A paper describes a structure:
The structures of TTERecR and drRecR exhibited similar folds. Four TTERecR monomers (A/B/C/D) in the asymmetric unit formed a ring-shaped tetramer with a central hole of 30–36 Å diameter. Two types of intersubunit interactions were observed between the neighboring TTERecR: the N-N dimer (A-B; C-D) and the C-C dimer (A-D; B-C). The TTERecR structure revealed that some residues of helix α1 (Ser4, Leu8, Leu12) in the HhH motif of one subunit had a hydrophobic interaction with some residues of helix α3 (Leu41, Ile45, Ala48, Lys51) in the HhH motif of the other TTERecR subunit. Moreover, Thr3 interacted with Asp63 in the loop of the Zinc finger motif to stabilize the loop. Two N-N dimers of RecR form a ring-shaped tetramer via an interaction between their C-terminal regions. The ring-shaped TTERecR tetramer is preferred during crystal packing and is predicted to stabilize the RecR structure.
RecR is the most conserved protein in the RecFOR pathway; RecR binds to RecO, and RecO interacts with SSBs, then the complex facilitates RecA filament formation on ssDNA-binding protein (SSB)-coated ssDNA. RecR is a zinc metalloprotein, which consists of a helix-hairpin-helix (HhH) motif, zinc finger motif, Toprim domain and C-terminal hydrophobic region. At present, the HhH motif is thought to be required for binding DNA, the zinc finger motif plays a structural or DNA-binding role and the RecR Toprim domain is the binding site for both RecO and RecF.
Author numbering:
A (entry chain A): 0 to 196
B (entry chain B): 2 to 196
């Protein structure tokens, strides 16, 4: 057992996802063993990141400015909007180092259990961007779980009346996977979505 | 003991059995009741002597013509190519495929000791010789092996004019953008379908 001020660190660190007890203890001692200025850096980086967070006025992504870097990039293709559930999906998609389009961040999915409706996530503003803008394609890239799929599907009906091309990211068997260890639901999509040549 | 040493040799020849595991299995085995090791030994050869290969699809079942190829609706004009008998039960568990199969028993891996005549390719072409099949579905694994094998069977199948398709690569159901490898994600993106 540890002094209170250390128990307090350990407890605060253990609240973070993927940080168990032993891992928290370790980190606490490492931290309180770092030079005071290094621990000041950590501590301030934490507080400042939270304080400085803003949501882009165009796509709602996490940013520092009024309009995020991506939206203000002009040789980036504003006629294609990749719709995503969360800020960190934008990073995942952005790391695919193809894709010159822009983004729309919903901040969630439709979810009757969580009690989240379409009016509780950034859907209407997606509509408005498509209504008021010159949009060639909306790529629905929510997750392929039930709610990500319900959400992409809700959005798709909505955008129908506009004459936009709306696509959904390919479900299937992941690269490097094997048929044996693939759930039956994915096999089904892999088969059903098979493609020529 | 030379008899144990040979057991150990025979065991570690097998896939998934490392040197230590062969040895531990070897001792367990020589400790089993005689009638249990007889049974193990018997099961080994009996499965080799009784095994079949379907006359149409080359799957191992205990029928000369397997129950799928025999089934009257099953659609012989569409053939789903997989590597392994376990793959057939995988695909079947989806309670959705209508066509029939072609089991290769393996893939083409230079780095393992297997080539395009160590597996059941020529016999697949023969099925596609008379022009009576529409699509061959290529459903080898989306790994290195699987993919080689498939993009090749596909050249061979090019004549014959049949329609050849490939099991769709992408993000699996239940998966999420955060934990999907870039390669898979890039495929999910560049293969997106109009909803
Ligand atoms: Zn933005
Ligand atoms: Zn058969």
């Amino acid at each position: 057992y540890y002094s209170t001020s250390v128990a307090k660190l350990i407890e605060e660190l253990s609240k973070l996802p993927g940080i168990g007890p032993k891992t928290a203890q370790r980190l606490a001692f490492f931290i309180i063993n770092m030079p005071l200025d290094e621990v000041r850096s950590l501590s301030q980086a934490i507080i400042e990141a939270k304080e400085k967070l803003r949501y882009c006025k165009i796509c709602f992504n996490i940013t520092d400015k009024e309009v995020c870097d991506i939206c203000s990039d002009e040789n980036r293709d504003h006629s294609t909007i990749c719709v995503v559930s969360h800020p960190m999906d934008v990073v995942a998609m952005e790391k695919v180092k193809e894709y010159k389009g822009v983004y729309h961040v919903l901040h969630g999915v439709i979810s009757p259990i969580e009690g989240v409706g379409p009016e509780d996530i950034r859907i209407k503003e997606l509509l408005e961007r498509v209504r008021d803008g010159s949009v060639k394609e909306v790529i629905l890239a929510t997750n392929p779980d039930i709610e990500g799929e319900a959400t992409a599907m809700y959005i798709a009906k909505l955008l129908k009346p506009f004459g936009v091309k709306v696509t959904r990211i390919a479900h299937g068997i992941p690269v490097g996977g094997d048929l044996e260890y693939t759930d039956v639901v994915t096999l089904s999509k892999a088969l059903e979505g098979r493609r020529e040549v």
